[PDB]
N, CA, C and O atoms as a MOPAC input file, in Angstrom:
PM7 MOZYME 1SCF
protein

 N      0.84900 1    -1.21300 1     0.00000 1
 C      0.00000 1     0.00000 1     0.00000 1
 C      0.87600 1     1.25000 1     0.00000 1
 O      0.48000 1     2.29500 1     0.51700 1
 N      2.06000 1     1.13500 1    -0.58000 1
 C      3.02300 1     2.25000 1    -0.56700 1
 C      2.91400 1     3.05800 1    -1.85000 1
 O      1.91600 1     2.97400 1    -2.56500 1
 N      3.94300 1     3.83900 1    -2.13300 1
 C      3.99100 1     4.63500 1    -3.33500 1
 C      4.85700 1     3.89700 1    -4.34500 1
 O      5.93300 1     3.40700 1    -4.00200 1
 N      4.39900 1     3.81500 1    -5.57600 1
 C      5.04300 1     2.99600 1    -6.58600 1
 C      6.21500 1     3.72000 1    -7.24000 1
 O      6.26900 1     3.87200 1    -8.46000 1
 N      7.14300 1     4.16100 1    -6.40900 1
 C      8.39300 1     4.69900 1    -6.89800 1
 C      9.53900 1     3.77100 1    -6.55100 1
 O      9.59700 1     2.64200 1    -7.03700 1
 N     10.46200 1     4.24400 1    -5.70300 1
 C     11.54400 1     3.39400 1    -5.13000 1
 C     12.24300 1     2.53100 1    -6.19300 1
 O     12.67000 1     1.41200 1    -5.91000 1
 N     12.35400 1     3.06200 1    -7.41100 1
 C     12.94300 1     2.32400 1    -8.55600 1
 C     11.99700 1     1.22000 1    -9.00900 1
 O     11.83000 1     0.21000 1    -8.32400 1
 N     11.38500 1     1.42100 1   -10.15900 1
 C     10.40100 1     0.48300 1   -10.66300 1
 C     11.03000 1    -0.56600 1   -11.55100 1
 O     12.09300 1    -0.35500 1   -12.13500 1
 N     10.36100 1    -1.69400 1   -11.64200 1
 C     10.82400 1    -2.80100 1   -12.46100 1
 C      9.69000 1    -3.39700 1   -13.26700 1
 O      8.51800 1    -3.28600 1   -12.90500 1
 N     10.05600 1    -4.02800 1   -14.35900 1
 C      9.10200 1    -4.66200 1   -15.24500 1
 C      9.13000 1    -6.16300 1   -15.04200 1
 O     10.20100 1    -6.75600 1   -14.90500 1
 N      7.96300 1    -6.77900 1   -15.02400 1
 C      7.88100 1    -8.22200 1   -14.95300 1
 C      8.01100 1    -8.82100 1   -16.35000 1
 O      7.10900 1    -8.68900 1   -17.17700 1
 N      9.13300 1    -9.47600 1   -16.60500 1
 C      9.40000 1   -10.07200 1   -17.90400 1
 C      8.56900 1   -11.32300 1   -18.12900 1
 O      8.14000 1   -11.59400 1   -19.25100 1
 N      8.34200 1   -12.08700 1   -17.06800 1
 C      7.66500 1   -13.37100 1   -17.19100 1
 C      6.56500 1   -13.49800 1   -16.14800 1
 O      6.45900 1   -12.67800 1   -15.23700 1
 N      5.75300 1   -14.53000 1   -16.29100 1
 C      4.72200 1   -14.84200 1   -15.32000 1
 C      5.31700 1   -15.69800 1   -14.21000 1
 O      5.85100 1   -16.77700 1   -14.46800 1
 N      5.22300 1   -15.22000 1   -12.98800 1
 C      5.82000 1   -15.91000 1   -11.85700 1
 C      4.79100 1   -16.15600 1   -10.76300 1
 O      3.98500 1   -15.28100 1   -10.44700 1
 N      4.82600 1   -17.34900 1   -10.19100 1
 C      3.90900 1   -17.72100 1    -9.12500 1
 C      4.67400 1   -17.87000 1    -7.81600 1
 O      5.68500 1   -18.56800 1    -7.75100 1
 N      4.18300 1   -17.21000 1    -6.77900 1
 C      4.78400 1   -17.28500 1    -5.45200 1
 C      4.82600 1   -18.73200 1    -4.95900 1
 O      3.94200 1   -19.52700 1    -5.27900 1
 N      5.84800 1   -19.06900 1    -4.18400 1
 C      5.99100 1   -20.42500 1    -3.66300 1
 C      5.64900 1   -20.44500 1    -2.17700 1
 O      4.91800 1   -21.31600 1    -1.70500 1
 N      6.18800 1   -19.47800 1    -1.45600 1
 C      5.91500 1   -19.31900 1    -0.04200 1
 C      5.35900 1   -17.91300 1     0.19500 1
 O      5.43200 1   -17.07400 1    -0.70300 1
 N      4.80300 1   -17.63000 1     1.38900 1
 C      4.23800 1   -16.30600 1     1.71800 1
 C      5.27500 1   -15.18100 1     1.66000 1
 O      4.93600 1   -14.00700 1     1.81400 1
 N      6.53200 1   -15.54600 1     1.43700 1
 C      7.60300 1   -14.57200 1     1.31100 1
 C      7.72100 1   -14.06700 1    -0.12500 1
 O      8.37100 1   -13.05300 1    -0.37900 1
 N      7.09300 1   -14.77400 1    -1.06000 1
 C      7.11500 1   -14.38200 1    -2.46700 1
 C      5.76400 1   -13.81500 1    -2.88200 1
 O      4.75500 1   -14.04100 1    -2.21400 1
 N      5.75100 1   -13.07800 1    -3.98500 1
 C      4.50700 1   -12.57800 1    -4.55300 1
 C      4.38700 1   -12.95600 1    -6.01900 1
 O      5.38800 1   -13.10000 1    -6.72200 1
 N      3.15600 1   -13.11300 1    -6.46600 1
 C      2.87800 1   -13.48000 1    -7.84400 1
 C      2.88100 1   -12.25200 1    -8.75400 1
 O      2.23500 1   -11.24600 1    -8.46200 1
 N      3.61300 1   -12.35000 1    -9.85300 1
 C      3.67600 1   -11.27800 1   -10.83900 1
 C      3.37000 1   -11.82900 1   -12.22100 1
 O      3.59300 1   -13.01000 1   -12.48700 1
 N      2.86300 1   -10.98100 1   -13.09600 1
 C      2.56800 1   -11.39000 1   -14.46100 1
 C      3.30100 1   -10.47800 1   -15.43200 1
 O      3.56600 1    -9.31800 1   -15.12000 1
 N      3.62600 1   -10.99800 1   -16.60300 1
 C      4.30200 1   -10.21500 1   -17.63400 1
 C      3.50900 1    -8.94700 1   -17.94900 1
 O      2.34900 1    -9.01100 1   -18.35600 1
 N      4.15100 1    -7.80000 1   -17.75500 1
 C      3.48500 1    -6.53300 1   -17.97500 1
 C      3.15700 1    -5.81600 1   -16.67700 1
 O      2.59000 1    -4.72400 1   -16.69500 1
 N      3.51100 1    -6.42400 1   -15.55300 1
 C      3.29700 1    -5.80300 1   -14.25300 1
 C      4.46100 1    -4.89700 1   -13.90000 1
 O      5.61900 1    -5.22700 1   -14.15600 1
 N      4.14600 1    -3.75700 1   -13.31100 1
 C      5.16100 1    -2.82500 1   -12.85300 1
 C      5.34000 1    -2.96200 1   -11.34500 1
 O      4.45600 1    -2.61200 1   -10.56300 1
 N      6.49500 1    -3.47500 1   -10.95600 1
 C      6.80000 1    -3.73600 1    -9.55600 1
 C      7.62300 1    -2.60100 1    -8.96300 1
 O      8.37700 1    -1.93600 1    -9.67300 1
 N      7.47600 1    -2.38500 1    -7.66900 1
 C      8.26900 1    -1.38900 1    -6.96800 1
 C      9.37600 1    -2.06100 1    -6.16300 1
 O      9.10500 1    -2.94200 1    -5.34700 1
 N     10.61700 1    -1.64900 1    -6.39000 1
 C     11.75400 1    -2.24800 1    -5.70200 1
 C     11.84600 1    -1.77400 1    -4.25900 1
 O     11.91600 1    -0.57600 1    -3.98100 1
 N     11.84600 1    -2.73100 1    -3.35900 1
 C     11.97400 1    -2.46100 1    -1.94100 1
 C     13.38900 1    -2.79000 1    -1.48600 1
 O     13.96500 1    -2.09800 1    -0.64600 1
 N     13.93700 1    -3.85600 1    -2.05500 1
 C     15.29300 1    -4.29200 1    -1.75300 1
 C     15.83000 1    -5.10400 1    -2.91900 1
 O     15.25200 1    -6.12600 1    -3.28900 1
 N     16.93000 1    -4.65300 1    -3.49500 1
 C     17.50500 1    -5.31200 1    -4.64800 1
 C     19.00200 1    -5.55200 1    -4.45400 1
 O     19.75800 1    -5.59400 1    -5.42500 1
 N     19.42700 1    -5.70800 1    -3.20100 1
 C     20.83800 1    -5.93500 1    -2.90900 1
 C     21.21000 1    -7.40000 1    -3.14300 1
 O     22.38300 1    -7.77100 1    -3.09300 1
 N     20.20100 1    -8.21800 1    -3.39800 1
 C     20.39900 1    -9.63400 1    -3.67500 1
 C     20.45600 1    -9.82800 1    -5.18600 1
 O     19.78200 1    -9.11300 1    -5.92600 1
 N     21.24800 1   -10.78000 1    -5.64800 1
 C     21.42100 1   -10.97900 1    -7.08100 1
 C     20.32700 1   -11.86600 1    -7.66400 1
 O     20.03000 1   -11.78700 1    -8.85500 1
 N     19.73000 1   -12.71000 1    -6.82800 1
 C     18.78000 1   -13.70700 1    -7.31400 1
 C     17.35200 1   -13.31500 1    -6.97200 1
 O     16.41800 1   -13.63700 1    -7.70700 1
 N     17.18600 1   -12.62200 1    -5.85800 1
 C     15.85900 1   -12.26900 1    -5.37000 1
 C     15.74000 1   -10.76900 1    -5.13800 1
 O     16.56000 1   -10.17200 1    -4.44000 1
 N     14.71700 1   -10.16900 1    -5.72300 1
 C     14.44200 1    -8.75800 1    -5.52500 1
 C     13.10100 1    -8.58800 1    -4.81800 1
 O     12.07100 1    -9.06800 1    -5.29200 1
 N     13.12700 1    -7.90200 1    -3.68600 1
 C     11.92500 1    -7.66600 1    -2.90000 1
 C     11.14200 1    -6.51800 1    -3.50700 1
 O     11.66900 1    -5.41600 1    -3.66100 1
 N      9.89200 1    -6.76800 1    -3.85000 1
 C      9.06900 1    -5.77400 1    -4.52400 1
 C      7.64800 1    -5.75800 1    -3.96600 1
 O      7.25100 1    -6.65900 1    -3.22700 1
 N      6.89100 1    -4.72900 1    -4.32500 1
 C      5.47500 1    -4.65500 1    -3.97900 1
 C      4.63400 1    -4.56000 1    -5.24600 1
 O      4.88400 1    -3.71300 1    -6.10300 1
 N      3.63900 1    -5.42900 1    -5.35800 1
 C      2.64300 1    -5.32100 1    -6.41600 1
 C      1.34900 1    -4.83800 1    -5.82400 1
 O      0.70300 1    -5.54700 1    -5.05200 1
 N      0.96300 1    -3.61600 1    -6.18600 1
 C     -0.26800 1    -2.94000 1    -5.73500 1
 C     -0.35500 1    -2.78600 1    -4.21600 1
 O     -0.56100 1    -1.68700 1    -3.70300 1
 N     -0.19900 1    -3.88200 1    -3.52100 1
 C     -0.18200 1    -3.89200 1    -2.05900 1
 C      0.65200 1    -5.05200 1    -1.51700 1
 O      1.04300 1    -5.04600 1    -0.35000 1
 N      0.92000 1    -6.03900 1    -2.35800 1
 C      1.55600 1    -7.26800 1    -1.90600 1
 C      3.07300 1    -7.14600 1    -1.95000 1
 O      3.66600 1    -7.08400 1    -3.02700 1
 N      3.69600 1    -7.11000 1    -0.77900 1
 C      5.14600 1    -7.07100 1    -0.69000 1
 C      5.71300 1    -8.47500 1    -0.58300 1
 O      5.32600 1    -9.24700 1     0.29400 1
 N      6.62800 1    -8.79900 1    -1.47600 1
 C      7.23000 1   -10.10900 1    -1.47000 1
 C      8.47800 1   -10.15500 1    -2.31000 1
 O      8.86000 1    -9.16100 1    -2.92800 1
 N      9.11400 1   -11.30400 1    -2.33500 1
 C     10.29900 1   -11.51000 1    -3.13700 1
 C      9.94100 1   -12.11300 1    -4.48100 1
 O      9.01000 1   -12.91000 1    -4.59200 1
 N     10.69100 1   -11.72200 1    -5.49800 1
 C     10.57800 1   -12.31800 1    -6.81600 1
 C     11.97000 1   -12.53000 1    -7.39700 1
 O     12.92000 1   -11.86900 1    -6.97900 1
 N     12.10200 1   -13.44700 1    -8.35800 1
 C     13.36600 1   -13.67700 1    -9.05700 1
 C     13.84300 1   -12.42900 1    -9.79600 1
 O     13.11500 1   -11.86700 1   -10.61400 1
 N     15.06300 1   -12.00300 1    -9.50300 1
 C     15.66600 1   -10.85800 1   -10.17400 1
 C     15.82400 1   -11.12800 1   -11.66400 1
 O     15.91800 1   -10.20100 1   -12.46700 1
 N     15.85200 1   -12.40700 1   -12.02300 1
 C     15.97700 1   -12.81400 1   -13.41500 1
 C     14.66100 1   -12.62100 1   -14.16100 1
 O     14.61800 1   -12.67600 1   -15.39000 1
 N     13.59300 1   -12.39400 1   -13.40800 1
 C     12.25900 1   -12.25200 1   -13.99000 1
 C     11.86200 1   -10.79200 1   -14.07800 1
 O     10.81600 1   -10.45500 1   -14.63200 1
 N     12.69700 1    -9.93300 1   -13.53100 1
 C     12.37500 1    -8.52800 1   -13.43200 1
 C     13.51200 1    -7.68000 1   -14.00100 1
 O     14.67100 1    -8.09400 1   -13.98200 1
 N     13.17900 1    -6.50000 1   -14.50200 1
 C     14.16800 1    -5.62900 1   -15.11800 1
 C     13.93100 1    -4.17900 1   -14.71800 1
 O     12.79400 1    -3.70900 1   -14.68000 1
 N     15.01800 1    -3.48000 1   -14.42200 1
 C     14.98600 1    -2.03600 1   -14.14800 1
 C     14.16200 1    -1.28100 1   -15.19300 1
 O     14.45000 1    -1.35600 1   -16.38800 1
 N     13.14400 1    -0.55800 1   -14.74200 1
 C     12.44700 1     0.39600 1   -15.60500 1
 C     13.04000 1     1.78600 1   -15.42200 1
 O     12.81000 1     2.68800 1   -16.22800 1
 N     13.80200 1     1.94000 1   -14.35400 1
 C     14.43000 1     3.21100 1   -14.02200 1
 C     15.66600 1     3.42900 1   -14.88200 1
 O     16.33700 1     4.45200 1   -14.74900 1

């Protein structure tokens, strides 16, 4: 429920969360970067859902 700035990213692929720590994203979704210090997992928020997603599935829009 935050502001969709904080460096935005594009969802390249359709991804399904595995655990409550991940969030589901679809190709064409604009995610907000919360933490991207990890090479494999980038913490993002979709609309309201904060979770981790594969950094390989997301790309800097900034």
